[PDB]
Design a binder for these strands. Structure first.
Length: 175
DNA sequence: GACGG
DNA sequence: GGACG
């Protein structure tokens, strides 16, 4: 229902954009599992808010990257906003920032240098920065590393496609 | 502009 | 198994 994480997008749309237009415009980006136009309890009208759940986080991220800022109708004045949605549990409505989506955390052989890591992970997208966690006295690698990509979908692709022995997960922010 | 079926 | 002087 909510698996995998970061596979649901949050939309700020026109109150007059129906679910069918969301399906037509967002289905190219992946396997849609649920489209949900949020309606006001008292008027039963759209609040101008929607959720779209995709089968993969990479699909949700590509949808966000391509569709944020687009318009969906002639009567629509403002562009739509598309974010990765917060979970139902907790998630105090705060917008997920791109910095929380672009960096992955991997287990790697001790022999890897930062350029070895970049070589193995450049195939999933444009890498902004690679680092390896080392003993800062001796310089020896602790076998853990970070890869930050330019786009959230690139980090999602890496997590979904790289060898399972890397144990690739989204990296928590430092603070 | 944030949570149903 | 797992975290950034």
């Amino acid at each position: 229902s909510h698996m995998p994480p970061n596979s649901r997008i949050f939309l700020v749309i026109s109150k007059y954009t129906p679910e069918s237009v969301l399906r037509e415009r967002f289905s190219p980006f992946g396997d849609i599992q649920d489209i949900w136009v949020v309606r006001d309890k008292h008027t039963k009208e759209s609040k101008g808010i929607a959720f779209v759940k995709f089968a993969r986080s990479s699909q949700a991220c590509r949808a966000m990257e391509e569709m944020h800022g687009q318009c969906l109708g002639p009567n629509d004045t403002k562009p739509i906003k598309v974010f990765i949605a917060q979970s139902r549990s907790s998630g105090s409505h705060r917008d997920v920032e791109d910095e929380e989506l672009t960096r992955i955390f991997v287990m790697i052989p001790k022999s890897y240098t930062e350029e070895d890591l970049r070589e193995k992970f450049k195939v999933y997208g444009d890498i902004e920065y690679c680092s390896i966690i080392k003993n800062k006295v001796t310089g020896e690698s602790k076998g853990l590393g970070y890869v930050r990509y330019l786009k959230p979908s690139q980090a999602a692709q890496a997590i979904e496609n790289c060898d399972r022995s890397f144990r690739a997960i989204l990296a928590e922010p430092k603070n």
